[PDB]
Write a protein that binds this ligand. Structure first.
Ligand SMILES: *[C@@H]1O[C@H](CO[C@@H]2O[C@@H](C)[C@@H](O)[C@@H](O)[C@@H]2O)[C@@H](O[C@@H]2O[C@H](CO)[C@@H](O[C@@H]3O[C@H](CO[C@@H]4O[C@H](CO)[C@@H](O)[C@H](O)[C@@H]4O[C@@H]4O[C@H](CO)[C@@H](O[C@@H]5O[C@H](CO)[C@H](O)[C@H](O)[C@H]5O)[C@H](O)[C@H]4NC(C)=O)[C@@H](O)[C@H](O[C@@H]4O[C@H](CO)[C@@H](O)[C@H](O)[C@@H]4O[C@@H]4O[C@H](CO)[C@@H](O)[C@H](O)[C@H]4NC(C)=O)[C@@H]3O)[C@H](O)[C@H]2NC(C)=O)[C@H](O)[C@H]1NC(C)=O
Ligand SMILES: *[C@@H]1O[C@H](CO[C@@H]2O[C@@H](C)[C@@H](O)[C@@H](O)[C@@H]2O)[C@@H](O[C@@H]2O[C@H](CO)[C@@H](O[C@@H]3O[C@H](CO)[C@@H](O)[C@H](O[C@@H]4O[C@H](CO)[C@@H](O)[C@H](O)[C@@H]4O[C@@H]4O[C@H](CO)[C@@H](O)[C@H](O)[C@H]4NC(C)=O)[C@@H]3O)[C@H](O)[C@H]2NC(C)=O)[C@H](O)[C@H]1NC(C)=O
Lengths: 207, 200
């Protein structure tokens, strides 16, 4: 019989006024004999009528996959509203219902710290600046680097990791030329997270 | 359905620990219950696989791999055959091919703003390694440490990897000049080991 899986919005999308956060309801193992899927969508129980449902798509394994997408207000998501996806299909004994919302824990401001390059990489002509971000919850977060107003380029970030007290931490690594460090420039680690004031905080470093 | 798994890094890098794959077969019919295995290494056949002790049973099977075989990325041909299948189904496993690259290892002391908190966060940067198979741990005065978590390896723009491991200690302790130690194990190293250490 069909199964249903229900995905939340991407963290970057929840956290950013210019993006489009969506929950996505995917149904799979839909047969040829009972191919029609019907979706109903609810926000904290009230039916909504403007998800965008995609036509069915046959998969290499000869089952249909049918997907339905609902855009969520930024503030709804963040205020714990719950999104239910109800799926019907003749091959099911009864409709299947899944519900999703932000993680339910008590929210927790992350702590941001910046870290100078290792004293021993101070020779090789590229160095590494490290941003430690920790104690945050939920794990949905967004980290960037920047120098004098401008957004940086070559940095990479670890996913959040579950810490032993139930909170999360990650690190972000940023590579610049030795000479750019040594010239006393200011680098800045930005963190966007629901529990910070104005959903944003920033820490900087140099020599 | 057929899936083929790798050994757990410390197993393959240590001359005495025992490294082991797994061909886990899922979704075997109470209709067609019989399942026959055929693992080859490099397409030549051996038989010394073991076979582990809701709606179905998902039937296991365990092999040991020569340390040298797996470090030389031997191709661990798995082959499962049921009557519910069209052909015989076949997974195929190795460590990642490519030039092995040695990790660079780096300890970092707490941030100065963190000094004002109640416990400190000692950090271990580990970068430039390939393949991603690795193993990190913390010890102080030659004694296992417990309070440490470690990020997964993250892929870097030159195809190499990195991670950081954060060990969390009592505030007072760091200040009593204690030498604390990060230990890393990886194939590309001399002795598949290296310590690096830091203190006040
Ligand atoms: C026939 O094919 C079908 C389609 O498969 C394709 O075709 C075949 C031929 C083959 O080629 C496949 O490779 C092809 O993929 C098969 O459907 C698949 O079925 C399985 C189940 O049988 C599904 O498995 C689940 O998958 C998710 C992981 O979700 C996916 O990641 C996978 C793996 O990377 C990826 O392939 C999928 O596409 C999903 O990716 C995510 O999709 C979403 C939405 O599209 C993306 O989010 C959206 O992104 C947009 C951008 O595009 C926007 O940003 C938007 O905002 C956003 O919403 C998302 O980014 C994308 N992510 C990634 C990384 O790609 C697992 O979560 C899921 O959970 C598991 O559930 C198990 C029970 O089944 C359980 O055992 C596990 O614990 C686990 O987790 C639990 O599950 C609970 C409920 O059961 C949860 O409530 C609970 O939280 C959790 N609990 C615990 C304790 O952990 C499960 O693993 C698979 O997704 C299907 N694939 C697709 C593509 O639909 C079909 O099976 C097959 N049929 C037959 C008979 O063979
Ligand atoms: C009920 O049984 C469940 C499993 O058996 C099932 O039996 C039937 C009911 C039937 O429906 C059948 O289809 C099922 O097989 C138990 O639930 C859980 O099963 C989990 C799988 O969802 C299993 O997770 C494993 O995680 C371990 C890690 O410790 C891995 O060994 C392993 O690998 C992965 O496979 C998943 C597929 O879900 C994939 O998403 C992962 O990323 C990873 O490999 C990936 O494989 C796919 C190949 O298609 C690729 O797309 C990816 O690239 C690849 N990923 C990467 C990073 O390379 C397992 O999945 C759990 O062990 C198990 N749950 C628990 C809680 O133990 C269930 O336990 C049982 N119920 C009860 C009540 O006991």
């Amino acid at each position: 019989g069909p199964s249903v899986f229900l995905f939340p919005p991407k963290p970057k999308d929840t956290l950013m006024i210019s993006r489009t956060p969506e929950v996505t309801c995917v149904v799979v193992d839909v047969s040829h004999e009972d191919p029609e899927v019907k979706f109903n969508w609810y926000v904290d129980g009230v039916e909504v009528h403007n998800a965008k449902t995609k036509p069915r798509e046959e998969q290499y394994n000869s089952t249909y996959r049918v997907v339905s997408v609902l855009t969520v207000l930024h503030q709804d998501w963040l205020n714990g509203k719950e999104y239910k996806c109800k799926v019907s299909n003749k091959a099911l004994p009864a409709p299947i219902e899944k519900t999703i919302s932000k993680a339910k824990g008590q929210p927790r401001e992350p702590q941001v710290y910046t870290l100078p390059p290792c004293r021993d990489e101070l020779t090789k002509n590229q160095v590494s600046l490290w941003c430690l971000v920790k104690g945050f919850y939920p794990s949905d977060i967004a980290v960037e680097w920047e120098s004098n107003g401008q957004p940086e380029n070559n940095y990479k970030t670890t996913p959040p990791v579950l810490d032993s007290d139930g909170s999360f931490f990650l690190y972000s690594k940023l590579t610049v030329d030795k000479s750019r460090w040594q010239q006393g420039n200011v680098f800045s680690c930005s963190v966007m997270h629901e529990a910070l004031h104005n959903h944003y905080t920033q820490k900087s470093l140099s020599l």
